[PDB]
Ligand binder design. Structure first.
Ligand SMILES: COC1=C(OC)C(=O)C(C/C=C(/C)CC/C=C(/C)CC/C=C(/C)CC/C=C(\C)CC/C=C(\C)CC/C=C(\C)CC/C=C(/C)CC/C=C(/C)CC/C=C(/C)CCC=C(C)C)=C(C)C1=O
Ligand SMILES: CCCCCCCCCCCCCCCCC[C@@H](O)O[C@H](CO[C@H](O)CCCCCCCCCCCCCCC)COP(=O)(O)OCC[N+](C)(C)C
Ligand SMILES: CCCCCCCC/C=C\CCCCCCCC(=O)O[C@H](COC(=O)CCCCCCC/C=C/CCCCCCCC)COP(=O)(O)OCCN
Ligand SMILES: NC(=O)C1=CN([C@@H]2O[C@H](COP(=O)(O)OP(=O)(O)OC[C@H]3O[C@@H](n4cnc5c(N)ncnc54)[C@H](OP(=O)(O)O)[C@@H]3O)[C@@H](O)[C@H]2O)C=CC1
Ligand SMILES: CCCCCCCCCCC1=C(C)C(=O)C(OC)=C(OC)C1=O
Ligand code: SF4
Ligand code: SF4
Ligand code: SF4
Ligand SMILES: [Zn+2]
Lengths: 176, 144, 54, 208, 96, 63, 115, 156, 342
């Protein structure tokens, strides 16, 4: 089923011909466009007052990365390297070894934020909810080197954003 | 209805603590609306709400004039919002951290820090692994 | 998603409870699923025209 | 079967097999093979000399009317003596059908240009020449389409490295962008992902 | 459990610190070194051992689906406690 | 009609490979050995071409 | 008979003729390229570089390979005449930001492990 | 001294004028530029900050690199950066611009625009949201506010 | 050799050369070329800067990530020098003005600053020190610039006995004050030359040659305590050199003689500019002295460098000074100048 977009003919009676001549000579449709813009002039603008007001986000929002902890303070990461294997951009670099108490923990965990595509595949692949994409998006830097995160930086991000991260995970985990 | 809107403007002038507060908020936020106070930060940021505004303008923050180490009377940024009020302000939830406080943990930062790029506190990356190849140390004593 | 855990990953609650779900999550996020040999040309009416993948 | 399995369509399968037999009967000089896949896609493997005739017959015949050239591309299989596999995908609006035609070539044997059959082929052929190195004879304007000016080699060949051989940077001594041999601060990490257990018995090959 | 190297550089939880003769220290001049102060090994050492009256215990990290895959730990050895390979919590049968 | 060239095939000048990467390099042609950790033999079917291993070093930043 | 389809040339003589035509075209082009691109090199340097590029492939004996080389050279010349190339693409033939890599055994031994 | 005070005030005036009138070039490459369009859209309205797009490099102050820089494109980007009168600034936006991103290991992609032009601000994201790019613009404004050209000239 | 400082790689941008260098005066003419050559092979370069950071931006794309580190320094404060030379095995000194400011005279920038840098480098354990002097440096010179240069190299050799002193002669390049100076002198109609420039001989040297010589001196083990003279392959009478400069720029050459006192008065008149002077009395002095001949000193050829003639690189500097009508003229058009070569 289909319809035609430009297959209408104009009536050739004196009424319609005179109306079209008046349209040509007195510019009625141009005045209609002016009226449309004038109508938009008196409407309330859609602008928000950033940075004092912010656009709405969701619990699923994928922002800055963070490494999380158990409530005891122990790191959730077990150096399984699933996030490294799944990363479409090869942004994750991991090295591991047994800890002094024999625990499976990372020694190196770097994420190249200038390689990252922010897809969220790493937190899907993680089996212990260790690495997440946090709610933060305002972390622009002045040098390239500041965007090459190591384990300490990501652990600090987790320690700093855990209050919001846990709430977002609590709000979203029943869909996952 | 003109007198009504003019009286509303006078009310906005008077509800900011007089003329000086009106000018302070006008030159600090380019906005002079008055809303219901929701809460205040330990750093001094105040959060206001007005459900009669359209989505996006119904929640806003008046930033503090002095965070951790810098003066933020003019130099403010969105990185000054702590995570709980960050979740409230971005409409990820409908509940302020006053009525719904976050879960307390012993490893969570008690003091929020803003974006420290361009400052001596900026993050400098480094390799966190140990040396891999160990070199042979020659003896310190003569051999003859 | 298709109820076939050899193509689609199981739910995170199942992966943390069942051995098969954990094995399939691990193998789907490390190796991925194998696709049987063959070639296809698939096209859709994308907003800009016919968009196709060979 | 049921819910998780893709349903079959035997009607389209029989129709495509019949039309493949039809085409093979009409052009025995070039048609070497005909195939219909499980998801009802008809493929015709031809001799390289028959590119212009067969395609023309598929475009102009009353019972074929494959008026649209959807896509033309190449596949590189280094294990074959004829390295490059030239693939034409055609759409017929009159019969609401799709067909595929496949031929072969090596590095030094040109393939006849198809622009006189389908104008849409023009850029497509250029792209093949740019990406695989297949020369098309009698192409009205054959040159690189996708690569940089002066680029050496054909990147879509399997033996071409992923990051290439040269990279670009601005140099202040000469005040210009220059090309230098590639050096990577982090090398691309090769992953061995294939399982050592066979997945699909239906495709098992004779043990030779 | 942070610790300072003989030069004043903080030693991270991975035990990494530049030698006195390493030039890379110049990357921290006029700037700082990012070290996380919450050493997970000490924090997990501070956790008390859980007494349980069964030979086999179950651990999932707490929170149900928000923890780790559920594992079962054998407690037949009275010499040492049973540790979770995921979260590091320790369990033990009553003795003494 | 054909031209009947009588020389061995050589396409080196047409591939854009630098000279250093043609003459110096050594390729290994081999059927990969079975991974001793597993019993499957599906990775021992085809032949593989690989190049000789060159120098890898540590990046001064990020190691 | 090896059953080989030609590209342009039946045998080697026509291949050398096509090579000579392309060389004439490049030799004519060089001064115009030096003028238009505002190059700091001389015309003699450009013609020497063209000669070096032609002599790089002097060992080829297959007429089809020579034919394809002439096709690629024609593509390069057409790119240069229409000013599709920029000054950077033109001067990439000269490698001025690259240090001279030594060829003797001892210098290679000193710098690293590459043969 | 009086001269130090005068040069400080003049620095303040010039820095305020330069950061309060930022005119980026009409320049975008890929998906990231779409988010740039959303930063000029009515919801965010970058024009309200004094930020106006202008097509000519001669009449532009900022270069926002929004998209993947390829080898074929690098000389053009360098050319239109050089034709920008000074003082000029460069904002790198998105993963491809910052370090190559999803195409870092490609044979035809420049691994970060800082190999071609100096960069003042790096905005992470694939793509960064319009709010993220606005935050980067305000950070660049602060960085301009920190400039001390006339003080440095006076102390010479 | 401290394993982290062992060369690795192919010698490119991402390679490791084993050089950690602090380049004082890296934001100037020679400094940018030196930093570029250090960063090409993968060195760690420390840039001490006193200017506004906007003036260092062009040095950023010259190295891989983390390979160039910018730090503030003060010439009169030894703590800044120590901070910027703590971890370097090479210290290059390129500090110097062609005029005197109200805070730094020639003794401040050619004697005091080099001496403080050298002493701090010696106490910090720095292995190599490259110091730049002038070929015409002379204790009994009519130029204060050169007297200060001679005193400064004496003090530098005193403080750092193993230092390498490099004495170039009127470096010419894209951002020089040698070819651009004479080319810009076209704005005053006629070209004033003392004695018509017939009693002055110049031996200018290319900028890339000087930078490559510095790099090779860093990498050469026998050049520890030597003194080098970096000169070009040809010697020109000043009149012929300026005539050739105007010929390459396609500008009408109108030379006239000016008395020495009148030209000194003109230089003093131009010295009053609070900004960078157009010319100075010291500049007028230095332009009209014949370049010294020091055959006893090693040159660029001792560092494996063939000096580039002026006739090969003059167009890349002087094409900017042409009108639209002559922009596309070739390099071999303009009749190489006559040389007084022994
Ligand atoms: C390489 O360095 C230099 C610069 O830096 C890039 C300069 O700008 C610079 C000055 C720039 C010129 C364009 C100045 C020319 C202006 C002159 C003062 C005009 C001459 C006198 C005028 C008032 C014209 C009227 C003549 C009579 C009526 C008196 C000079 C000289 C220089 O040498
Ligand atoms: C007379 C003709 C010749 C001269 C032409 C010039 C005419 C006069 C120029 C008028 C100057 C007015 C500019 C002052 C406006 C600044 C407002 C205030 O905001 O500035 C703050 C601080 O002020 C600045 O630091 C200094 C600006 C003024 C400089 C000092 C005055 C110097 C006047 C000297 C005049 C001499 C002219 C030349 C004579 C020949 C910085 O705040 P800012 O971060 O932005 O805003 C944050 C945005 N938020 C609020 C939305 C979050
Ligand atoms: C009893 C004897 C009295 C004497 C006779 C007097 C009677 C006169 C009656 C006729 C008067 C007509 C006046 C109009 C003059 C030109 C109008 C016209 O016909 O031109 C239009 C075109 O005019 C336009 O469309 C204008 C385009 C640009 C529009 C710009 C903005 C529109 C104006 C906004 C409001 C204008 C306000 C004007 C007053 C300002 C205050 C001074 C024709 O163009 P087309 O439709 O393409 O057809 C051509 C082929 N047949
Ligand atoms: N130019 C030539 O023809 C040859 C050069 N000379 C010598 O070669 C050296 C470098 O040459 P060139 O690059 O042309 O000189 P430049 O004038 O171009 O560079 C001067 C450098 O020294 C710094 N500098 C100057 N004064 C001070 C100061 N008081 N405190 C801190 N830093 C200062 C400048 O920093 P800032 O940008 O902040 O001002 C700048 O980085 C110089 O020592 C020069 O004397 C040797 C023979 C001639
Ligand atoms: C004034 C209205 C806002 C205009 C924003 C100009 C953005 C300039 C980027 C150029 C560009 C344009 C114009 C554009 O239309 C487009 O879509 C195909 C792009 O790809 C994302 C672009 O990069
Ligand atoms: S978000 Fe995607 S690209 Fe980024 S680190 Fe995770 S898996 Fe890699
Ligand atoms: S973050 Fe998660 S997926 Fe990645 S290594 Fe750690 S435990 Fe494994
Ligand atoms: S960073 Fe991501 S969104 Fe931006 S241009 Fe690259 S691929 Fe597109
Ligand atoms: Zn557990």
């Amino acid at each position: 089923t289909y319809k035609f977009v430009n297959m209408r003919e104009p009536s050739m009676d004196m009424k319609s011909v005179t109306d079209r001549a008046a349209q040509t000579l007195l510019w009625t449709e141009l005045v209609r466009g002016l009226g449309m813009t004038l109508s938009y002039l008196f409407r309330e603008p859609a602008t928000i007052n950033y940075p004092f007001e912010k656009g709405p986000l969701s619990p699923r929002f994928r922002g800055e990365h963070a490494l999380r902890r158990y409530p005891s303070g122990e790191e959730r990461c077990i150096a399984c390297k699933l996030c490294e294997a799944v990363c479409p951009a090869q942004a994750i670099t991991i090295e591991a070894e047994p800890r002094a108490d024999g625990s499976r923990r990372t020694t190196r965990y770097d994420i190249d934020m200038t390689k990252c595509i922010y897809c969220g595949f790493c937190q899907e692949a993680c089996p212990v909810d260790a690495i997440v994409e946090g709610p933060n998006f305002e972390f622009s830097t002045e040098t390239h080197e500041e965007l090459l995160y190591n384990k300490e930086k990501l652990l600090n991000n987790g320690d700093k954003w855990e209050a919001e991260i846990a709430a977002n995970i609590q709000a979203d985990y029943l869909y996952r | 209805e003109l007198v009504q809107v003019l009286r509303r403007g006078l009310q906005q002038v008077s509800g900011h603590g007089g003329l000086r507060g009106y000018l302070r908020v006008l030159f600090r936020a380019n906005d002079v609306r008055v809303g219901t106070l929701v809460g205040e930060d330990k750093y001094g940021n105040k959060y206001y709400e007005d459900n009669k505004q359209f989505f996006g303008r119904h929640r806003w923050v008046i930033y503090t004039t002095e965070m951790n180490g810098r003066d933020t009377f003019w130099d403010v940024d969105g990185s000054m919002v702590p995570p709980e009020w960050h979740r409230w302000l971005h409409c990820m939830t409908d509940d302020p951290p006053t009525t719904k406080p976050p879960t307390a943990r012993k490893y969570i930062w008690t003091n929020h820090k803003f974006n420290v790029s361009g400052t001596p506190q900026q993050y400098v990356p480094y390799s966190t692994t140990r040396k891999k190849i160990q070199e042979w140390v020659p003896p310190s004593t003569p051999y003859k | 998603k298709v109820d076939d855990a050899k193509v689609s990953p199981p739910k995170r609650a199942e992966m943390k409870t069942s051995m098969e779900s954990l094995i399939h999550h691990f193998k789907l996020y490390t190796e991925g699923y194998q696709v049987p040999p063959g070639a296809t040309y698939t096209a859709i009416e994308a907003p800009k025209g016919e968009f196709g993948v060979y | 079967t049921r819910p998780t399995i893709r349903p079959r369509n035997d009607v389209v399968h029989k129709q495509l097999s019949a039309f493949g037999q039809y085409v093979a009967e009409i052009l025995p000089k070039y048609v070497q093979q005909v195939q219909v896949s499980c998801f009802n896609e008809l493929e015709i493997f031809i001799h390289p000399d028959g590119v212009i005739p067969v395609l023309t017959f598929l475009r102009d015949h009353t019972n074929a009317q494959f008026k649209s050239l959807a896509d033309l591309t190449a596949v590189d299989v280094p294990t074959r003596q004829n390295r490059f596999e030239i693939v034409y995908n055609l759409l017929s609006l009159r019969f609401n059908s799709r067909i595929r035609v496949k031929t072969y070539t090596d590095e030094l044997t040109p393939i006849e240009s198809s622009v006189t059959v389908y104008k849409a082929a023009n850029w497509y052929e250029r792209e093949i020449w740019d990406m695989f190195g297949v020369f098309f004879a009698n192409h009205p304007d054959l040159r690189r389409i996708l690569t940089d000016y002066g680029f050496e080699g054909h990147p879509f060949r399997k033996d071409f490295p992923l990051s290439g051989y040269v990279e670009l940077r601005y140099d202040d001594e000469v005040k210009r962008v220059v090309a230098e041999p590639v050096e990577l601060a982090q090398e691309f990490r090769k992953f061995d992902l294939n399982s050592p257990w066979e997945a699909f018995p239906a495709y098992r090959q004779p043990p030779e | 459990g942070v610790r300072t190297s003989p030069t004043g550089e903080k030693v991270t939880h991975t035990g990494q610190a530049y030698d006195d003769g390493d030039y890379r220290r110049v990357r921290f001049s006029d700037r700082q070194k990012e070290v996380n102060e919450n050493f997970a090994i000490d924090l997990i050492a501070e956790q008390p051992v859980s007494e349980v009256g069964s030979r086999v215990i179950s651990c999932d990290g707490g929170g149900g689906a928000l923890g780790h895959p559920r594992v079962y730990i054998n407690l037949d050895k009275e010499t040492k406690t049973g540790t979770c390979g995921y979260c590091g919590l320790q369990f033990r049968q009553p003795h003494h | 009609q054909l031209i009947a060239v009588d020389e061995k095939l050589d396409i080196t000048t047409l591939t854009g490979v630098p000279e250093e990467h043609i003459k110096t390099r050594k390729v290994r042609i081999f059927v990969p050995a079975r991974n001793n950790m597993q019993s499957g033999v599906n990775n021992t079917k085809k032949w593989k071409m690989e190049f000789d291993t060159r120098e890898r070093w540590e990046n001064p930043l990020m190691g | 008979g090896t059953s080989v389809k030609p590209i342009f040339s039946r045998d080697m003589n026509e291949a050398k003729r096509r090579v000579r035509e392309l060389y004439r075209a490049w030799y004519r082009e060089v001064p115009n390229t030096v003028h238009l691109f505002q190059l700091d090199i001389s015309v003699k340097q450009g013609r020497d570089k063209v000669r070096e590029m032609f002599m790089k492939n002097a060992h080829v004996t297959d007429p089809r390979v020579v034919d394809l080389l002439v096709i690629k050279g024609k593509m390069e010349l057409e790119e240069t005449i229409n000013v599709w190339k920029q000054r950077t693409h033109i001067m990439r033939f000269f490698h001025e930001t690259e240090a001279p890599r030594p060829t003797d055994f001892l210098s290679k031994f000193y710098v690293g492990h590459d043969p | 001294s009086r001269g130090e005070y005068v040069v400080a005030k003049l620095d303040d005036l010039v820095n305020w004028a330069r950061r309060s009138s930022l005119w980026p070039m009409t320049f975008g490459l890929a998906c990231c530029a779409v988010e740039m369009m959303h930063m000029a859209a009515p919801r965010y309205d970058m024009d309200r900050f004094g930020v106006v797009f202008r097509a000519s490099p001669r009449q532009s102050d900022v270069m926002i690199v929004a998209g993947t820089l390829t080898n074929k494109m690098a000389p053009a980007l360098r050319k239109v950066y050089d034709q920008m009168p000074e003082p000029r600034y460069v904002v790198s936006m998105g993963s491809c611009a910052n370090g190559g991103g999803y195409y870092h290991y490609s044979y035809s992609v420049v691994r970060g625009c800082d190999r071609i032009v100096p960069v003042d601000i790096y905005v992470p994201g694939c793509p960064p949201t319009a709010e993220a790019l606005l935050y980067g613009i305000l950070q660049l404004q602060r960085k301009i506010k920190r400039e001390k050209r006339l003080r440095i000239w006076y102390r010479r | 050799l401290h394993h982290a400082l062992i060369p690795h790689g192919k010698g490119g941008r991402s390679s490791v050369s084993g050089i950690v260098a602090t380049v004082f005066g890296a934001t100037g003419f020679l400094g940018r070329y030196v930093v570029n050559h250090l960063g090409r092979m993968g060195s760690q370069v420390i840039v001490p800067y006193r200017c506004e950071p906007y003036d260092t931006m062009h040095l950023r794309p010259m190295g891989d990530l983390g390979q160039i580190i910018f730090m503030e320094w003060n010439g009169k404060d030894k703590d800044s020098i120590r901070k910027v030379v703590e971890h370097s095995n090479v210290v290059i000194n390129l500090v110097g003005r062609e005029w005197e400011t109200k805070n730094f005279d020639f003794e401040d920038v050619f004697v005091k600053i080099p001496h403080a840098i050298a002493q701090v480098s010696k106490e910090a354990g720095v292995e190599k020190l490259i110091h730049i002097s002038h070929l015409n440096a002379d204790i009994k010179s009519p130029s204060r610039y050169l007297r200060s240069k001679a005193v400064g190299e004496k003090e530098v050799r005193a403080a750092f006995p193993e230092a390498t002193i490099i004495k170039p002669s009127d470096i010419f390049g894209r951002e020089d004050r040698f070819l651009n100076y004479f080319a810009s002198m076209r704005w005053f109609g006629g070209v004033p030359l003392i004695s018509l420039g017939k009693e002055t001989v110049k031996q200018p040297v290319y900028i890339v040659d000087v930078s490559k010589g510095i790099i090779n001196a860093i990498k050469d083990p026998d050049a520890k305590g030597k003194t080098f003279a970096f000169v070009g392959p040809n010697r020109y009478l000043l009149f012929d050199l300026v005539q050739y400069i105007f010929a390459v720029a396609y500008r009408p050459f109108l030379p006239y003689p000016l008395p020495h006192f009148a030209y000194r008065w003109v230089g003093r008149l131009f010295e009053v500019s609070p900004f960078e002077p157009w010319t100075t009395r010291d500049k007028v002095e230095r332009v009209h002295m014949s370049d010294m001949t020091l055959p006893h000193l090693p040159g660029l050829e001792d560092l494996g460098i063939q000096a580039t003639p002026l006739e090969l690189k003059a167009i890349e500097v002087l094409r900017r000074h042409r009108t639209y009508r002559w922009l596309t003229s070739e390099m071999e058009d303009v009749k190489p100048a006559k040389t007084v070569n022994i």
